[PDB]
Predict the 3D structure of the following.
Amino acid sequence: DVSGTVCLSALPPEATDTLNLIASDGPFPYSQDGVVFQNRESVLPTQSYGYYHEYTVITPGARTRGTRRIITGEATQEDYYTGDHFATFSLIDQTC
C-alpha cells in the first residue's frame, strides 16, 4: 500500500532534481536510472511489467546510490517517493 501523498516541497530538494531529469529524459547520473521496477513485493498497485521505472534520488555525501528513489508509474502525475529502499512509499504531489 501507499502511505499517503506528500507535497514535493516537503521532500528533500534532490527529489525535485530527479523529477526535473525525468521530465527532460536525462541525462541521469546513474546507469541504473530508468530501469524497470518489478514491484515484486506488491507494495504498489498491481500493473503490467514495465509500468513502473526506478530513478535515484541522490543522498548528499553517500558513496553509493543510497536508499532514496522515485518510482514513476505510467499514469499522468503518478510518481512515488521512497526514502527507505522500497519498504514504504508516498505519492508525490507536484502542485505543492
Notes: The chain has one helix and six strands. The two ends are 22 Å apart (CA to CA).
